[PDB]
From a paper:
Our biochemical and structural analysis of the E. coli MqsA antitoxin and the MqsR:MqsA-N complex provide a detailed 3-dimensional structural view of the free antitoxin and the TA complex. These structures combined with our biochemical data unequivocally demonstrate that MqsR, a protein previously shown to be critical for biofilm formation and the most highly upregulated gene in persister cells in E. coli, and MqsA form a novel bacterial TA system. Our data show that, as expected for a TA system, the expression of the MqsR toxin leads to growth arrest, while co-expression with its antitoxin, MqsA, rescues the growth arrest phenotype. In addition, MqsR associates with MqsA to form a tight, non-toxic complex and both MqsA alone and the MqsR:MqsA2:MqsR complex bind and regulate the mqsR promoter. MqsA itself is a two-domain protein with a novel fold that, unlike every other antitoxin, is well-ordered throughout its entire sequence and whose structure does not change upon toxin binding.
The zinc, which serves a structural and not catalytic role, is coordinated by four cysteines (Cys3, Cys6, Cys37, Cys40) with an average sulfur-zinc distance of 2.35 Å. In spite of the low sequence identity (12% identity, 18% similarity) in the MqsA-N domain among different species, these zinc-coordinated cysteines are perfectly conserved, suggesting that all bacterial MqsA proteins adopt a similar fold. The interaction between the two, long twisted β-strands and the five turn α-helix of the MqsA zinc binding domain is stabilized by an extended hydrophobic core composed of 11 residues: Ile18, Tyr20, Phe22, Leu29, Ile32, Tyr36, Met45, Phe53, Val57, Phe60 and Val64 (residues in beige). The DALI server was used to identify proteins with similar folds. Although more than 269 hits were obtained (Z-scores from 3.2 to 2.0), they aligned to only the two long β-strands and the five turn α-helix; none had the combination of strands, helix and the zinc binding pocket observed in MqsA. Thus, to the best of our knowledge, MqsA-N is a zinc binding domain with a novel fold, hereafter referred to as the MqsA fold. In contrast, no shift is observed when the DNA is incubated with either MqsA-N alone or the MqsR:MqsA-N complex.
Numbering used by the authors: 1 to 67
Amino acid sequence: MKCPVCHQGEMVSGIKDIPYTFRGRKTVLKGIHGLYCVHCEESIMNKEESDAFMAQVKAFRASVNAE
Ligand SMILES: [Zn+2]
């Protein structure tokens, strides 16, 4: 499929480590499955992929808020 954001790159199946900063705290969200644009790096995650990703995101946010 063509990337729905940059309209030139192709979407490919992959696993990526995703940097994230929340309330000034920096982390890398490891091993996130999804489709990724080879050109602009836009991600497309289906329901199951989104659930896994957001579990990581929310665990990180919770830890930051409690610290
Ligand atoms: Zn793209």
